[PDB]
Design a binder for this molecule. Sequence first.
Ligand SMILES: Oc1cc(F)ccc1CNc1ncccc1-c1ccncn1
Lengths: 244, 244
Amino acid sequence: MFDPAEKYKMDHRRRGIALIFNHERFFWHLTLPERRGTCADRDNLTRRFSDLGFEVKCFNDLKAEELLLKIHEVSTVSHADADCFVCVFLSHGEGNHIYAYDAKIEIQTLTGLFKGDKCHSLVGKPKIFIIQAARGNTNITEVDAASVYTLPAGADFLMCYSVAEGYYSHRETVNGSWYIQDLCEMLGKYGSSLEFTELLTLVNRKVSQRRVDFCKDPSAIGKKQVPCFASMLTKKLHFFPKSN
Amino acid sequence: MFDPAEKYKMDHRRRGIALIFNHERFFWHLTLPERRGTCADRDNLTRRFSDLGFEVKCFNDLKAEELLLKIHEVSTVSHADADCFVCVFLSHGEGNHIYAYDAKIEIQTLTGLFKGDKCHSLVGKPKIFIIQAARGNTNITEVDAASVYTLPAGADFLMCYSVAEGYYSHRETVNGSWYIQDLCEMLGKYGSSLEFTELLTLVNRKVSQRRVDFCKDPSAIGKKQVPCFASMLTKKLHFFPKSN
Ligand SMILES: Oc1cc(F)ccc1CNc1ncccc1-c1ccncn1
């Protein structure tokens, strides 16, 4: 009965929710820099995910408690009538942690709320996390060292990462993160036609190909960016237009 | 002219080398169990990779020095005339380490030898690592806890993992590892037709779907296996049959 071309069923009434936690500033006593440009990331993502049928819900500079409450809320609501779930972190991170405004949170505990154990309505449905996080140091290009582990999650999770270990994350202070720029461009051109990992692969090409030989800053030279993704998907994932 | 359907060029004279480091026993003073069944993994892989045009080269129970010498050898030979490179570890691991016979080796240092910097002949060519490693506990099913970090590598690397964090790796003592059985079956049916990550996705479905409710051992119940992969590929990867 088994089928090599099998797709996730993307014919539910609604596409689903895209959460976007967007962190620009941080509590003084953490000594983390402003992520100038993250608002371009937030806006570009919000548009592209809207266009694919997502109920996008942004949240600027939440503290740990607020963030946990919001994501727990979304986990316990029924996704019975939904194709999939997307969650995006634009912040600083270290190891297995993302930074809220006031403290770091274990990525494991955020992804764990959708494990299908904990959230029955999303069993057998794609759960995509996109993470644009790294180490805190007119349109300048600021450069952070990779810091967030390229963790997997569980069955039917796709974890997507701005940068792999050893490489470097770039953010233009007006245009935003290189990862998110190229992601959003490819979503723009291909989101509705291409399989999502085929697209994520295009993003890897586009970001790896960005030249870093002749740079305005002398010490940003030879700092290449290579993003990855960790698939535990079990079927092809397409965001074909849902019919009106 | 940027192209969403673009493929790695797989028209070089030879397909390339598949290394297989296969560890069954270990130095007494490490206190690691025999991996009974790993020979089925080694043989099944050897066949399937042969059939796709690979010069397969197996190495049973090498010590650290021997293993490093062998893999460094293969890194410094010219791959100019080759499509790609495959390297497979069947052993125990912990964190960012694989076990040789006598001691553990940093996966980073093994994958590092093929980073475009260090190995010019493989720049722009797929470098696939397949890792069937976990924590040391007629045809019995032995069950190990996930232990090896699902690390990325660099540009044009595909890292493939038996099991993700939190889940469990299964090995039948005659048929071999669940990961490798389902990988080899899918290679058998689809290797030559399907795109390789499409296939790795089928392997994720097949392994996640293995029932663990009614088990011979009482304490092996509810121990699910979900394998992942970390793509930093930049093009589609096909193993179409080569002529002559
Ligand atoms: O993925 C697994 C699998 C396990 F069995 C156990 C733990 C992890 C955590 N993942 C990581 N993934 C990718 C890069 C690094 C880590 C990392 C690195 C340093 N410390 C902790 N983690």
